[PDB]
RNA sequence: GGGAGACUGGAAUUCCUGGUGUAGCGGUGGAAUGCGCAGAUAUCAGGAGGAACACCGGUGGCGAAGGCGGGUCUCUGGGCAGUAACUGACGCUGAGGAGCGAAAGCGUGGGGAGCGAACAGGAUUAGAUACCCUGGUAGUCCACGCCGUAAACGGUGGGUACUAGGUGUGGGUUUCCUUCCUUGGGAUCCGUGCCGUAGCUAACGCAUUAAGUACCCCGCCUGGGGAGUACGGCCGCAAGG
């Protein structure tokens, strides 16, 4: 296939970052995860792991014909900064940045506080 | 576990009792114990209400734990010494279960001596509420070369600088490229040959400056965390460089 | 050093080679204050290297140093009540000191029957990139790379 | 005031409640 | 401080139909602006909030665009 | 946001279905149970269902207290201000008594997304019937009823009169700066905070919202344990009160 323009979905949790490049109709074409680049355990929560995953996903989208992308960040800040920086640094042009984080209108009960 | 008891005077049976009572504390210590010694003494003066004095010293993996008690007889002194040593070893543990409630927790709630210091940016916070744009420089748009732009950088003591290039006729921004040298960003990326000749070791950013609005530019700067953003304004159609100022507002440099 | 950095001792240049590095080397190989014996050992090693290779001692010594000079290391750093192996950039003086110390120490474990011959062989191998000190530099750089994730603090 | 008094009262109440739990069935069979 | 533009003698009435008068009172994310950053009195702030919620219910304002 | 009933809105979590799509996802101080390779997580589209209502939103409003905010409609209680038309001491308190009374808990019938006692494994530990992790039943929800307890606290019973002030903030009337836009300022009534005189207190502190000065009525205390326990009695399906 050849998709010149697509979207980038970055989900940065507190212990992992998942980057997926997506044909704008919503179809994932190449994804790289924090644990997919050789990290495991707490090591995959670091910004460096997010950098590696973003670069790997960028290459796995680039050889598929993706040139310009727009990023949808999501999740508590762990490696979003480095994720977008690495997406740019791997030769993938960034169109727009959008923060789409699921924000409930006070629905569902959160788990009890740790100690 | 092996214990040596150095008694003194007449204390018949105290040695065996102390040995067997103290040797049971090896399981209590969370680290191997080495050369655990006990000493029993009796006060010569009958005027002392608690004449027997017991001392114990243990070497728990290099950490010295010592205790001392007084008693009316060998048995009571040994028992009190055992209780004291148990309390000391309990306070000594240092394993995770005993050091887990003192490790700093959460992100902002609670503060401790070793709690991670707050990350503070160079600029005054000035949150998005009334952030505003209250600094608009338009220093120079006379055409310049790379070396001339670098000199105009240096005496201005500014990390980045927006000028217009000689050869291209296009707006460009130079900045310190870190250990790689300097980096040049143009509104439309061009190779070095079209760019005017230079002697400084620099590199050119391959990406083009995108087209986007003022609010979108602020959002991109916030979500991208760069010290500045160089872009072609959507409404104006010309170059613009926004940087977070030294007072918390955004500094928009326009032609 | 609680009240600030301490002054450095300005060691003097060498008589028969006129370089700071050889004096640093003789100070490193010095034992029990026998400075004459250390100088004899170092000068003999340099002469042996000169005879073997045919070039000047100092240039091949500098090549060996640059071959075994490290640039990144790993230190135990405690942040937030937890310890990690953080890779750290090495200052040039520390890199030179570490390279010389590694050269001397690894030459002390060789099997060439004499300190002079062991040192000459070690410096020649380091110049050619075959010495055990080169291997130690490779391992420490590998360990610094493996823990790059902890470089942010 | 100090919570020592409250500790004594809660210990007494807890012990009484445990006793009631232990002898519930016996009290029912004798009552 | 700022002025309650409704307590004035020219204060326009608050309705859930006139969408511009409400759009000027919500942030760019669609959230209702605080009272201090606006400066209106408590009664007018409550009326503004009620009108905003009603307009959202009748699909006149986005639910956090 | 005082209460009851009815209808109804969106974000989000979970599950199901169908695309794209691979080898990990999840979790921690660090890991492992666990999920996935039979196609997980991720992303898009559609569908089902339950609960709670982000922004407004605070030491701000209402209520005797418990307590009460998604929106609209219906029914309904209380309070404040001004005029003072009206009745003419009809006021206050209140033993017993009756009613309301957080959460948990009990009964019948529904509902069950998330959370989650109990219960399983995983982990730490000398030992973990715990703290942490993965699952998870009652319960949390609705209808009708029970129970009648809380750090049900302002640890301060109700009513009244008086005793320096200064400054926030909520509601309502009015005079003068006067633009009359303006927290302009003043005056006054009713709340709600902070600081401070006199005064009171063992001290901390209270201080016109008294823990000050006095009057009327009620409840309660007489060293600490034993003990709010035993016996007897009343209530309760039971727990128990």
TrEMBL record, chain B:
The keyword Ribonucleoprotein does not apply. Pfam families: Ribosom_S30AE_C (PF16321), Ribosomal_S30AE (PF02482). GO terms for molecular function: ribosomal small subunit binding. InterPro entries: HPF/YfiA_ribosome-assoc (IPR050574), RHF-like (IPR036567), RHF/RaiA (IPR003489), Ribosom_S30AE_C (IPR032528), Ribosom_S30AE_C_sf (IPR038416). GO terms for biological process: negative regulation of translational elongation. PANTHER family: 30S RIBOSOMAL PROTEIN (PTHR33231:SF1). GO terms for cellular component: cytosolic small ribosomal subunit. Signal peptide: none annotated. Keywords: Translation regulation. Residues 129-184, 206-252 form the Sigma 54 modulation/S30EA ribosomal protein C-terminal domain. It comes from Mycolicibacterium smegmatis (strain ATCC 700084 / mc(2)155). Coiled coil: none annotated. This is Sigma 54 modulation/S30EA ribosomal protein C-terminal domain-containing protein.
From TrEMBL, chain D:
Residues 1-31 form the Ribosomal protein mS38 C-terminal domain. Coiled coil: none annotated. Residues 1-31 are annotated as: Disordered. It comes from the Bacteria. This is Conserved domain protein.
């Amino acid at each position: 296939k050849n998709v010149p323009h697509g979207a980038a979905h970055i989900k940065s949790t507190f212990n992992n970052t998942i980057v997926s490049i997506t044909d704008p109709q919503g179809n994932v074409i190449a994804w790289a995860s924090s644990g997919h680049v050789g990290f495991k355990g707490s090591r995959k929560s670091t910004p460096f792991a997010a950098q590696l995953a973003a670069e790997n996903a960028a290459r796995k989208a680039q050889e598929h014909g993706v040139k310009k992308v727009d990023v949808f960040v999501k999740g508590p800040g762990s490696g979003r900064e480095t994720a977008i920086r690495s997406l740019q640094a791997a030769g993938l042009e960034v169109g727009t940045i959008s923060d789409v984080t699921p924000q409930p209108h006070n629905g569902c009960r959160p788990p009890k506080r740790r100690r | 576990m092996d214990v040596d008891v150095s008694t003194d005077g007449e204390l018949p049976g105290a040695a065996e009792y102390a040995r067997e009572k103290i040797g049971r504390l090896s399981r209590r210590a969370h680290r191997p114990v080495l050369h655990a010694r006990v000493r029993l003494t009796r006060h010569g003066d009958p005027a002392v209400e608690r004449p027997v004095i017991a001392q114990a010293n243990l070497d728990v993996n290099g950490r010295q734990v010592r205790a001392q008690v007084e008693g009316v007889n060998a048995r009571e002194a040994v028992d009190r010494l055992e209780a004291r040593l148990r309390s000391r070893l309990e306070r000594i543990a240092e394993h995770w279960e005993a050091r887990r409630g003192g490790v700093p927790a959460e992100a902002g709630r609670e503060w401790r001596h070793e709690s991670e210091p707050a990350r503070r940016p160079g600029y005054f916070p000035r949150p998005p509420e009334e952030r505003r744009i209250i600094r608009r420089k338009s220093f120079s748009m006379v055409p310049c070369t790379v070396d001339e732009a670098a000199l105009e950088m240096e005496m201005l003591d500014y990390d980045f600088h927006l000028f217009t290039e000689k050869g291209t006729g296009f707006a460009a921004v130079l900045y310190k490229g870190g250990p790689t040298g300097y980096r040049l960003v143009l509104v439309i990326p061009v190779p070095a040959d079209e760019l005017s000749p230079f002697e400084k070791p620099i590199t050119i950013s391959t990406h083009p400056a995108p087209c986007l609005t003022q609010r979108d530019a602020v959002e991109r700067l916030g979500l991208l965390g760069l010290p500045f953003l160089f872009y072609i304004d959507a409404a104006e159609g010309r170059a613009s460089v926004i940087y977070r100022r030294y007072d918390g507002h955004y500094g928009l440099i326009t032609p | 050093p609680r009240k600030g950095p301490a002054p450095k001792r300005p060691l003097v240049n060498d008589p028969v080679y006129g370089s700071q590095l050889v004096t640093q080397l003789v100070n490193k190989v010095l034992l029990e204050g026998k400075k004459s014996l250390a100088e004899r050992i170092v000068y003999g090693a340099l002469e042996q290297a000169r005879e073997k290779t045919g070039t000047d001692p100092v240039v091949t010594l500098k090549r060996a140093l640059d071959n075994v000079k490290p640039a990144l290391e790993v230190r135990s750093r405690r942040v937030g009540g937890a310890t990690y192996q953080v890779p750290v950039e090495v200052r040039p003086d520390r890199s030179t000191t570490l390279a010389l110390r590694w050269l001397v120490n690894f030459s002390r474990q060789r099997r060439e029957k004499t300190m002079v011959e062991r040192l000459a062989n070690e410096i020649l191998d380091a110049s050619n990139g075959l010495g055990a000190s080169v291997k130690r530099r490779e391992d420490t750089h590998k360990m610094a790379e493996a823990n790059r994730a902890f470089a942010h603090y | 005031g100090s919570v020592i008094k409250k500790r004594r009262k809660r210990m007494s109440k807890k012990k009484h409640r445990k006793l009631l739990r232990r002898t519930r069935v016996q009290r029912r069979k004798l009552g | 401080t700022r002025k309650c533009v409704f307590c004035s003698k020219k204060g326009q009435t608050i309705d859930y139909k006139d969408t511009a008068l409400l759009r000027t009172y919500i942030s760019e994310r669609g959230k209702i602006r605080a009272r201090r950053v606006t400066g209106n009195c408590v009664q007018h702030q409550r009326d503004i909030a009620v009108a905003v919620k009603n307009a959202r219910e009748v699909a006149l304002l986005p639910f956090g665009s």
